[PDB]
Amino acid sequence: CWTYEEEYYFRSNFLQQYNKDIRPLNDLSKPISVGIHLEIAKMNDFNLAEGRLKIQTYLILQWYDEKIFWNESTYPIPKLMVSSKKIWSPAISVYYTENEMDSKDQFQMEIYKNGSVHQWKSFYFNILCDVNARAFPFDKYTCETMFYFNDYDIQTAIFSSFRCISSTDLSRKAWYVSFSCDTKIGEEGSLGQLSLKLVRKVSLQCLSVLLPLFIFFILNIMIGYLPIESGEKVTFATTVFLSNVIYIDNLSKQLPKESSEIPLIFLCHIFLAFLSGLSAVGTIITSKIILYIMTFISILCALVFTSLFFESFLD
Amino acid sequence: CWTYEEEYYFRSNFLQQYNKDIRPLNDLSKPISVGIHLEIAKMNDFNLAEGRLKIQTYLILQWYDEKIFWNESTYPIPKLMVSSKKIWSPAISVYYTENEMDSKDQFQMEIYKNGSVHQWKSFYFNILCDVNARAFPFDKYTCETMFYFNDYDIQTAIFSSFRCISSTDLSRKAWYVSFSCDTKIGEEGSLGQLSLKLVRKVSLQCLSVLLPLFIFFILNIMIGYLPIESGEKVTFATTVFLSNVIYIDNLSKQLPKESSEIPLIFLCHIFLAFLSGLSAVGTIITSKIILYIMTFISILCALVFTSLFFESFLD
Amino acid sequence: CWTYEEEYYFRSNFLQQYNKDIRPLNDLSKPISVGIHLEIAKMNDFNLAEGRLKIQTYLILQWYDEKIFWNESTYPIPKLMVSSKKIWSPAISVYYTENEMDSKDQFQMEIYKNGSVHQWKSFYFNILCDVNARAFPFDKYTCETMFYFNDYDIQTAIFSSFRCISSTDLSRKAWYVSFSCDTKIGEEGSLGQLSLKLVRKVSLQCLSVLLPLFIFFILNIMIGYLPIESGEKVTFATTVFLSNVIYIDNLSKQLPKESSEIPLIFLCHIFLAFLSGLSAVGTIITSKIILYIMTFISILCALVFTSLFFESFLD
Amino acid sequence: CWTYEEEYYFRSNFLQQYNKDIRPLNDLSKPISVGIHLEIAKMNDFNLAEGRLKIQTYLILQWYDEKIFWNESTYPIPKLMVSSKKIWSPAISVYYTENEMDSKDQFQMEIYKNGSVHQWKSFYFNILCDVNARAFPFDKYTCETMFYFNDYDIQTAIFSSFRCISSTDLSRKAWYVSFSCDTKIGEEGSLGQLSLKLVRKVSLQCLSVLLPLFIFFILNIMIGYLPIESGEKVTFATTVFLSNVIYIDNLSKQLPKESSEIPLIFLCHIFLAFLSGLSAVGTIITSKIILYIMTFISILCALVFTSLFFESFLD
Amino acid sequence: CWTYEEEYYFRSNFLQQYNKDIRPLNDLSKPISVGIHLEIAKMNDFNLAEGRLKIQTYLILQWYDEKIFWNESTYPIPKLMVSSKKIWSPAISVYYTENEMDSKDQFQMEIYKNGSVHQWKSFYFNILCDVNARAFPFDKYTCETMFYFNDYDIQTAIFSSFRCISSTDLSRKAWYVSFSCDTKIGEEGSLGQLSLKLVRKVSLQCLSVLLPLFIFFILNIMIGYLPIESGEKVTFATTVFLSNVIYIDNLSKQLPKESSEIPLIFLCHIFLAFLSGLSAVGTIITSKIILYIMTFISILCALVFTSLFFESFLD
């Protein structure tokens, strides 16, 4: 039941010989052990096509201050909240986001009688991702980032643990999210790794991108069965060809810009456009002076590519 | 009728033994009760398609400072405005917007003779929303967020109330907005839950989504009654099929992404496309030469989808 | 002809018993009168379709400091420039933009011998607008916001005047701008109201939005006078309908998010698409088993709508 | 060869009776003369269609501090670098960008033995521009802005000079950039006027726009020299009409907004559309059963517009 | 094995006669030598079409503080981490990004017993690039930036070295990146010149602009060898030519904005069009009153352009 006056007197006289610039140890030749417990709360996913996933994480850093220990016999307080600029706290940062991460300290530290210190932090940053889009829509992403100390190497401060959990609502929207994190020993200090794996789901909206690949397909075989007596055919074919190539342009603006392998949808569209153009050329050449063969080739190639797509299919 | 000199003296000598880092209580073993009165002022709606609603709220925090009580006998001032960095105030935040909420303190606190303190705050944040598009064009959105203390748990500071009102303009902008908020007890402290539910008002701007379905329904059913003597029947069937599939492609781009269940319009149109394609395939197979039974069943399937669509109709 | 040393001596000893947190009045029970002179400098109009106009205004606040009066007999200075953080100034803000307006105090206050103080401020904020699109593309907007004190109510500080002017270059670019501003008495203090009225010009570039409609009108009535012999008519028409319904979606994207009345362009496009669909159905049923009648109906409806548009026409 | 110790001693005792809030003059009734030397380094051009050109400029302000003069007899230092918050420097700003210019001071001031002070500044601001698109694609723009003291009027501080230069790599791509600079005298003190004139280059990619102008020209002339025996002439004329109007729309989507006058190419294509439609309706009348007059009118108008276009043609 | 108390005592008494505004030299008439070691970590190339590449670099500045030398005999500390606002550090900046680079000092400095000081910095800035489009899609970019001291010239501070390395993952993604950096001597002090060269990799996705040309080429050369007896030849030529105009319009939207040369592919296409259209004209006009000649010229010039492209062809 500590009253205001004694908490005031304590706060006046509990950092007497304390310098927040010095790691709180009785022997400074050894590292200070900091534990981390991380929770991935949300993902943005806006620029995931360009290779950047904007995620938010919550950290609970825990360490031991060996200079701010007291006992209730003299100060009947079991714990306190102390601002971040009054005592030593470690500065953490993640690779490739130093300049685009505001890092405003707003959560005070919580310090116990025996020196245990807990600090709350939240990071909102881009984690770069590598895209495997051979099967599209069902692209797969792998992401990685490393947390490190802003000022301390392995001989000055070390991550004693690194655990990650999830809010259970990461994978609720069009992603299978699987994470793993553990502490590594980097060249310039102790690092905490964080690896994410995102696998797109089978949403109807994502599969709508297949319909164009259907349309042209129909239109393609639909050049064959037309008024061959009329020259309209060649013109019609040309028209289709144009549309197809234009669509490919628009298509390239959606595909993950840089995949480990070329997506099969693009190859199918290229094949269809090439076949339509050659069909127009062939019909006009015949008019100057194959059907079943063209249909057989189309069927063979399309079935091979669809079989590959089924092979790479996920559920 | 306090003059400038006596208010100057009071301001000089009214925080003598006061530390703003300490909750203003005479017994600190119990939580400080903070009451909140909230008003949802505006909505953005821009990114509601992605699943984020950007709202602005005005908060009136009210608590009791037990160390700044005075009486008019010695200080003829009934109330004062004192800056946010002179006396203790609680820092509030909302889930999932810690790192994208500027939180600039610009309104001073108002303190009465007996310690009653009122503070004004304004938050402008993204409240994540979940979309149900079963009845699209009309969609339903549910949004939720929680307010919490940056620094205090249930044993150090508690929300004694949580009330919300509106500006009477949220309803006007093409949305039925209904909200409900109350104080909860979370795992890590007292929380203020705020829940929003947005339905979409009826607009004549949804003939854009009704007309195509009606016209395509009529065209599709009219394929049965044609100059069946003419082979053009299969031509009409194919052209209608392509038109339907192109419409599917266009439509799928204006449905919400994270839809809980597939919208009914999509099912109606995709089934109509299936029907027309089956009709064309049957016509061509007959020309070159179970189908009828399936078509008969299909019409019933469309009747089922249309009944579900009308059952979910709003006003 | 005051020298550096006497201005130095003055600046050292002219805020002796002054607290910038107190209103500079000899009797603090009465309000402090602050006069405002505003000027709308520029408009953005980028997001005006979404219902937000971004304007920049210049303010000249003028009040009387009843505690910093001096006379040239002792200090040969007629006036001074004193930084904003040395003497009391009122904090002003506007509705619905508290969280997205960066308060950078960069202009010093100008204080005369008799206490008159002038301060320069510049605000850059969104002002929400209500749209009327009954006549489109010649849409009309009404916008409105209020200025208020951050920290003072009617019994503490009051706007003694509120006057606005314009830079004369507001209406030079595709808008007729009319403004009006006066001081009101709000529930929570004195308010300064600012009302804008924007009316779009007749820019011939804007008129191209009517060009697509004309394309269809032609194609539409260009369905009857064709090689009807070729049942394909049905097909051409179905193409037309598809095109119209793919346009209408983009147009709905273009239209103002919400209008007090439904724009006529949308209704006309809906009618044209409907007529095209019925034309297809009619040719189909006729082939299973009007031209001049269809033309008369189209002419009547179009003339009625254009007559309503001309009735609503302004300038 | 001044050592560390004597520079330390100098820095300690060279602002003894110096207030940075007072203009450094021995007679403060007269203005302080500040000289400016500006260099336009880069332009952004991204929003130049909307009328905003984002430019970066480097300023070297020069003035004379009459209170920080010393001689090497007592302080063997010829010049020093002193931070911006130790001595008086003038605050400069530009019109219509006060709220969207960071204005971070990062370059120290260079002060010589006799008081001459040089300061570096870099502005990155939008400068509103007026577009003249009569000649398209060779559109031309004019921009202007003014620099002014944040805190001083003509009787307290004046610009003694205002010179400008370019970066020598400014007009090297797609623009003929010209500049002018002079010291005006407004109602709120001395002003520094900066005027820019941008003229688009003759990049052959832009000349691609002229290809359609000839195509649709060829097509209109071509309508007459065809198998007029076939009534299809109506169909072909309607086709060129529809294509021309569709183009007109697409091009209008490219023309700059708020243009001073309607571009010539727009009128050319409008008249070509009119000619095509007139020919189509004339052929329809012929089928129902002025030609040479229409051809003469069209040739005259098109040749007049082309002569004009080529008259303004640059290079 | 230094304990907390002696490090506290050291930090209290190791900046006794130190001014962080003074370069840490014993003879200040000579420059202070600062070494740099740079690493381009990532690049964004989102706006690379506009000519701006956004790269992130990591710097390790190294210099010698001649005033903070101590020895272990009195202070058993071999090195220390000291904040950036306790001792002198140089301010570095790069050309043309002063106003769009946050520059937050977050990494402390590491100082050794003998005065060697290291500092960590990270810059995230745009580096302007020049585009060569002669080989399309295999465009080549050249970029350059210059690092300099915010406050020091060649007689006050100098870059003793300037070395750059790479993270080895720059070129992993659709770019050949080759850097080079060395120190220069500019007119405003020592400079660090950084040069980049980007050359797009030869993918298959970047070979979908080959097919549209090739096919078109054939089509264009297939206008001559046709059933010339059939007058429809001219109609097919108009169809292909309209396709050509549409494809030219599409392609003009993909080229880099400001290329030094004229993209060869764009040339090929536009020239093929103009000459084929002239051939069709020639045919119709002559009938109103060459084929092989136009085919020969088209082949000659198209092959000349293709060879000109193959010349610079990369892999």
Ligand SMILES: *[C@@H]1O[C@H](CO)[C@@H](O[C@@H]2O[C@H](CO)[C@@H](O[C@@H]3O[C@H](CO)[C@@H](O)[C@H](O)[C@@H]3O)[C@H](O)[C@H]2NC(C)=O)[C@H](O)[C@H]1NC(C)=O
């Ligand atoms: C320093 O003091 C702190 C708190 O005074 C100690 O931490 C607390 O230690 C107790 C056990 O001594 C923990 O109790 C256990 O908590 C878990 C919750 O995960 C619960 O499941 C168990 O049934 C049990 O109640 C308590 O959680 C823990 N709290 C915190 C915040 O750490 C710490 O152990 C002391 N260290 C030393 C070296 O004395």
Ligand SMILES: *[C@@H]1O[C@H](CO)[C@@H](O[C@@H]2O[C@H](CO)[C@@H](O[C@@H]3O[C@H](CO)[C@@H](O)[C@H](O)[C@@H]3O)[C@H](O)[C@H]2NC(C)=O)[C@H](O)[C@H]1NC(C)=O
């Ligand atoms: C501490 O002092 C404050 C103000 O001096 C007290 O708050 C005020 O309490 C009075 C009643 O004592 C309230 O009067 C009532 O106001 C309501 C408005 O809802 C009105 O409908 C009633 O007819 C009556 O006039 C007054 O509103 C209220 N004002 C504020 C700003 O809180 C507070 O009760 C005092 N606390 C204690 C423990 O004495």
Ligand SMILES: *[C@@H]1O[C@H](CO)[C@@H](O[C@@H]2O[C@H](CO)[C@@H](O[C@@H]3O[C@H](CO)[C@@H](O)[C@H](O)[C@@H]3O)[C@H](O)[C@H]2NC(C)=O)[C@H](O)[C@H]1NC(C)=O
């Ligand atoms: C306190 O002192 C200030 C400045 O000495 C007084 O304001 C000034 O008052 C004079 C007249 O007393 C004004 O002169 C007039 O100015 C207008 C411009 O609007 C001009 O058109 C007239 O011909 C005449 O010259 C002067 O403008 C005005 N200046 C300012 C900045 O307010 C103020 O009246 C004094 N107040 C008291 C209570 O004595």
Ligand SMILES: *[C@@H]1O[C@H](CO)[C@@H](O[C@@H]2O[C@H](CO)[C@@H](O[C@@H]3O[C@H](CO)[C@@H](O)[C@H](O)[C@@H]3O)[C@H](O)[C@H]2NC(C)=O)[C@H](O)[C@H]1NC(C)=O
């Ligand atoms: C106060 O002292 C400063 C520097 O100590 C003087 O500025 C410098 O003045 C000298 C002449 O006294 C200038 O020398 C000339 O420089 C030009 C460069 O344009 C050169 O072409 C000539 O051959 C000659 O060397 C020097 O440039 C100039 N430097 C600067 C940075 O301004 C200033 O004149 C003194 N003022 C008074 C009132 O004594």
Ligand SMILES: *[C@@H]1O[C@H](CO)[C@@H](O[C@@H]2O[C@H](CO)[C@@H](O[C@@H]3O[C@H](CO)[C@@H](O)[C@H](O)[C@@H]3O)[C@H](O)[C@H]2NC(C)=O)[C@H](O)[C@H]1NC(C)=O
């Ligand atoms: C001032 O003290 C610092 C550190 O005490 C000295 O820097 C260090 O100097 C030693 C040699 O005296 C270097 O050792 C060598 O390091 C290289 C790594 O490149 C290694 O390959 C060699 O086998 C050898 O171990 C050490 O690297 C170096 N460290 C740093 C961070 O620079 C510095 O030389 C002293 N200055 C003077 C003037 O004595």
Ligand SMILES: CC[N+](CC)(CC(=O)Nc1c(C)cccc1C)Cc1ccccc1
């Ligand atoms: C949900 C409360 N939340 C977010 C509002 C995060 C939090 O404690 N989750 C958490 C963590 C971080 C680790 C393990 C287990 C759990 C449940 C509080 C918070 C913590 C640090 C910084 C900011 C907020």
Ligand SMILES: CC[N+](CC)(CC(=O)Nc1c(C)cccc1C)Cc1ccccc1
């Ligand atoms: C409209 C005035 N307004 C916004 C300009 C908000 C305000 O009082 N509404 C309100 C609240 C917040 C609670 C209950 C009842 C009402 C009417 C003032 C304000 C309050 C807090 C923070 C910022 C501004």
Ligand SMILES: CC[N+](CC)(CC(=O)Nc1c(C)cccc1C)Cc1ccccc1
């Ligand atoms: C044009 C000079 N200008 C803008 C550059 C604005 C200014 O005085 N016009 C003004 C105002 C604000 C009210 C009434 C009458 C007039 C002429 C100076 C300025 C004023 C306040 C803040 C920033 C700049």
Ligand SMILES: CC[N+](CC)(CC(=O)Nc1c(C)cccc1C)Cc1ccccc1
């Ligand atoms: C190129 C060096 N540069 C830009 C990196 C600008 C500079 O000296 N050009 C300059 C100026 C500003 C006026 C007249 C003549 C010249 C050559 C240095 C700089 C100057 C001021 C502010 C920031 C940087």
Ligand SMILES: CC[N+](CC)(CC(=O)Nc1c(C)cccc1C)Cc1ccccc1
């Ligand atoms: C990978 C660690 N990293 C980035 C996390 C960069 C780093 O040491 N690479 C580096 C440099 C900068 C120069 C030479 C050799 C190497 C390996 C540390 C770092 C350095 C400066 C600023 C911030 C972080």
